Amino acid sequence: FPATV
Amino acid sequence: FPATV
Amino acid sequence: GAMGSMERASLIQKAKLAEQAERYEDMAAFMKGAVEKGEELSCEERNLLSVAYKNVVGGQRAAWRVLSSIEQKSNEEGSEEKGPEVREYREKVETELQGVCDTVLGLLDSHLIKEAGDAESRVFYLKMKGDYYRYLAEVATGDDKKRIIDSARSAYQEAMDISKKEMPPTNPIRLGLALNFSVFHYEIANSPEEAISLAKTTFDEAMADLHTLSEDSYKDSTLIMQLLRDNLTLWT
Amino acid sequence: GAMGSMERASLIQKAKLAEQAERYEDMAAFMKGAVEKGEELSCEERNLLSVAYKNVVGGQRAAWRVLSSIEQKSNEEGSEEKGPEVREYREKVETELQGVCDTVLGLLDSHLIKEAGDAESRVFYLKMKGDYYRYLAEVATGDDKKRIIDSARSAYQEAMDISKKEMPPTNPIRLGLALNFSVFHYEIANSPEEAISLAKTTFDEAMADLHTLSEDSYKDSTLIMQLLRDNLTLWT
Ligand SMILES: CC(C)(Nc1ccccc1)C(=O)Nc1cccc(-c2csc(C(=N)N)c2)c1
Ligand SMILES: CC(C)(Nc1ccccc1)C(=O)Nc1cccc(-c2csc(C(=N)N)c2)c1
Ligand SMILES: [Mg+2]
Ligand SMILES: [Mg+2]
Ligand SMILES: [Mg+2]
Ligand SMILES: [Mg+2]
Ligand SMILES: [Mg+2]
Ligand SMILES: [Mg+2]
């Protein structure tokens, strides 16, 4: 999964 | 802490 | 409000204690109680709210993905019917996830966003609104899926418009918003080219503004810049 | 019983799904529902029950330790009074922990232990009874602390007596029971010499019986034997 903050 | 199972 | 009898300051204190104990459900309940006192939230308090619910919904999302994967395999050609249990339990987790998202969205709508006038608060809350509609979108399949996606897009877009007018390109809230809106494009809106463009332009504009920053601000901004690069590497 | 309307087999299936999703509170609720169907549990089902509650109470114990440590520091000479909040929140977690322990002990008393006639089931359940009284002992401070400790000791001792008569020294249940009873001696009963003796004698008697085992049984037994050695290394 891609990075999110 | 010591090991327990 | 089960937290209605607790002092606001005690709720904030206990949210911090719950964080140290990795009790994120408790942390979220404490911070919901603090929001429901009706006062605006400080910067630290906003981040306690977001950390709490991000951890709770993050666990739910991880569980939902495991169960969805098991469910799709049970539906492949050649699988032995296991009955309704996998679907039922995926639905149970899904409903609990939707409930957490609705709770967060409810706090933003009553009345965090409408009282948020400074860019740092308003952009933060609108980013959250986009994020929690995005999590709803991840599990949506019905008559409302397009509307959920558009609600996420609309919140992110208002946040983006404010952030471009009112914050520098290295502002960590602005960077994190762009990171997540880029993921929205890639994973939700089936717009990988928009996702890649947004991540690249955000990274480059931030790079050019790093020279204005202190060492500590530089560390904060470059951390999120590295996440943008990580995603670009994943996608290209 | 909120699980009263669900099929026993569906509860077991969903416990396994919850495990895969790392949803251990759900897993524990499913397995409590299965126990409350009133039928004895198979070996696999007993281990689903234990895995579920061990993970739930393990998280509570970790949180309690964090909060207890913060509380003791707030009580040291030179600390700025923070108010009742740390104590209150430690008490909240403590009460939830005690509730989980009472739930497990209740399942063992109604009526898992009384129907358990085979050594592998009876020793397993009595080990659990010792374990959950041990967790109660870890947080106990009142008129009942000595009685809680003695309840743990008594359950472990009955389990030990059965295991020595009915199982080989390499049996993994017997080994795990001895491991945990040794920790009870060291950490709860202030009997480190008993703890060390029990761990060493258990290890040595198991070593001498390994030659009787298949490769797979050997792997199971030596895994727990390594935990005994780990503890002995910690203690000597
Ligand atoms: C960038 C990141 C990872 N996420 C984020 C999420 C939504 C919108 C924008 C950014 C984040 O964390 N930024 C941050 C910046 C300043 C203070 C605190 C903070 C104060 S208190 C506290 C705590 N965990 N006790 C953390 C946290
Ligand atoms: C030794 C250990 C770590 N603990 C233990 C706890 C209390 C008393 C005795 C030992 C354990 O795990 N022994 C074990 C042995 C056989 C089957 C399963 C098992 C069947 S199903 C399943 C699952 N997690 N789905 C695990 C588990
Ligand atoms: Mg007040
Ligand atoms: Mg649904
Ligand atoms: Mg644009
Ligand atoms: Mg039936
Ligand atoms: Mg108490
Ligand atoms: Mg003895």
User: Measured at the alpha carbon of residue C214, what is the angle toward residues C213 and C219, in degrees to the nearest 5?
Assistant: 85
Nearest residue of D to residue C82, measured between CA atoms: D13
Q: Which residue's CA is the nearest one to ligand 2's atom 23?
A: D48
Q: Specify if C72 maps to a domain.
A: yes
Alpha carbon dihedral C11, C16, C18, C23, in 10-degree steps, equals 120
What gap in Å lies between CA D168 and CA D189, rounded to an integer? 27
Q: Does C6 touch chain D (CB under 8 A)?
A: no
Beta carbons of C20 and D70 less than 8 Å apart? yes
Q: Which two tokens stand for residue C94?
A: 């899904």
Q: Which residue's structure tokens are 């509380």? A: D71
In a domain, C152, yes or no: yes
Residue C209 and residue C170 in contact, taking contact as beta carbons nearer than 8 Å: yes
Residue D211's Cα: distance from chain center in Å? 29
Going D126 to D132 to D135 to D136, the CA torsion angle's sign is: negative
- Residue D175 inside a domain? The answer is yes
C30's tokens:
């404490």
D169 burial level (CB within 10 Å; 0-12, 13-18, 19+): buried
Helix D24-35 to helix D85-107 angle, to the nearest 10 degrees?
Answer: 40
Is C214 an 8 Å CB contact of chain D? no
Burial of C33 (0-12, 13-18, 19+ CB in 10 A): buried
Do the domain assignments include residue C205?
yes
Nearest ligand to the CA of C144 is 4
Q: Which long-range contacts (CB under 8 A, 24 or more apart) does C133-142 make?
A: C133/C101, C133/C105, C134/C180, C134/C183, C134/C184, C134/C188, C135/C57, C135/C61, C135/C97, C135/C101, C136/C98, C136/C101, C137/C188, C138/C61, C138/C64, C138/C187, C138/C188, C139/C64, C139/C94, C139/C97, C139/C98
Structure tokens, C147: 């509307």
- Report yes or no: D133 and D170 within 8 Å, Cβ to Cβ: no
Pick from C181, C170, C164: which is nearest to C225 by CA?
A: C170
Collapsed DSSP state (helix, strand, coil) of residue D83 = coil
Shortest alpha-carbon distance between residue D157 and chain C (Å): 34
Tokens at D35, concatenated: 């126990």
CB neighbourhood size of D99 (10 A): 11
CA C203/CA C169 separation, integer angstroms: 9
The dihedral sign for the CA sequence C9, C14, C20, C22: negative
What would the two tokens of residue C206 be? 């931030």
Structure tokens at D59: 């998280």
Q: Which residues of B touch D183 (CB under 8 A)?
A: 2-4
For residues D170 and C138, what is the distance between their CA atoms, to the nearest angstrom?
Answer: 49
Whose CA is closest to C21, among D137, D53, D70? Answer: D70
Alpha helices in chain D (DSSP H): 8-20, 24-35, 43-74, 85-107, 119-139, 145-166, 172-183, 192-207, 215-235
| Domain assignment present for C131 | yes
For every residue of chain C, which 3-state class applies, written as one string?
A: CCCCCCCHHHHHHHHHHHHHCCCHHHHHHHHHHHHCCCCCCCHHHHHHHHHHHHHHHHHHHHHHHHHHHHHHHHCCCCCCCCCCHHHHHHHHHHHHHHHHHHHHHHHHHHHHCCCCCCHHHHHHHHHHHHHHHHHHHHHCCCCCHHHHHHHHHHHHHHHHHHHHHHCCCCCHHHHHHHHHHHHHHHHHCCCHHHHHHHHHHHHHHHHCCHHHCCHHHHHHHHHHHHHHHHHHHHHC
Q: CA–CA separation, D29 vs D19, rounded Å? A: 12
Q: What is the CA radius of gyration of chain C?
A: 19
- Find the residues whose C-beta lies inside 6 A of ligand 2: B 5; D 19, 44, 47-48, 50-51, 124, 127, 172-173, 176, 224
Burial of C37 (0-12, 13-18, 19+ CB in 10 A): middle
Residues of D in contact with C14 (CB under 8 A): 85, 88-89
CB C155 within 8 A of CB C208: no
Angle at C223 between CA C221 and CA C226, to 5 degrees: 110
The ligand placed nearest to the CA atom of residue D223 is 2
C196's CB contacts (< 8 A; 6+ apart) are C182, C186, C232, C235, C236
- Contact (Cβ atoms closer than 8 angstroms) between residue D28 and residue D56: yes
Taking an 8 Å cut-off on Cβ atoms, the answer to whether B2 and D186 are in contact is yes
Among partner residues C23, C26, C66, which is closest to D20 by beta-carbon distance?
C66
Q: From which experimental method does this structure derive? A: X-ray
D111 prior amide bond cis, ω within 30: yes
Kindly list the distances between the CA atom of residue D73 and the CA atoms of C171, D24, D65, D82, D91, in Å, as whole numbers in the listed order.
37, 31, 12, 11, 16
Tokens 């509650």 — which residue? D53
* Torsion over CA: C26, D11, C58, C117 (sign): negative
CA distance readout (Å), D152 to C48, C80, D132, D163, D179: 40, 45, 8, 16, 14
Q: Is D24 helix (H, G, I), strand (E, B) or coil?
A: helix
Cβ pair D86, D71 in contact under 8 A? yes
Q: Is C51 in the pocket of ligand 1 (CB under 6 A)?
A: yes
The CATH number of residue D59's host domain is 1.20.190.20
Residues in chain A preceding a C-to-N separation beyond 2.5 angstroms (breaks): none
Which residue is it, tokens 């390594």? D226
Rounded to whole angstroms, the Cα distance separating D63 from C23 reads 7
> In this structure, is residue D3 part of a structural domain?
no
Question: Is the backbone peptide bond immediately before C111 cis, with ω within 30 degrees of 0?
Answer: yes
- Cβ atoms of C96 and C56 within 8 Å: the answer is no
Q: Closest CB to D14: pick one of C10, C17, C85.
A: C85
Q: C-alpha D186: how far from its chain's center?
A: 15
* First-residue to last-residue Cα distance in chain A: 13
Number of domains into which chain C is organized = 1
d(CA D159, CA D168): 14
Q: Long-range contacts made by residues D109-117, C-beta under 8 angstroms, separation at least 24?
A: D111/D38, D112/D35, D112/D40, D112/D41, D115/D40, D116/D40
Calculate the alpha carbon distances from D89 to D65, D121, D139 in Å. 12, 37, 14
Q: What is the resolution of this structure in A?
A: 1.6
Q: What is the Cα–Cα distance from C37 to C84, expressed in whole angstroms?
A: 43
| C190 domain residue, yes or no | yes
A3 min Cα distance to partner chain C (Å): 6
- Helix, strand, coil distribution of chain B in percent, nearest 5: 0, 0, 100
Cα-based distances in Å from C8 to C13, C34, C197, C201: 9, 5, 43, 41
State which residues form the domain around C71.
8-235
Residue C2, in any domain of the structure: no
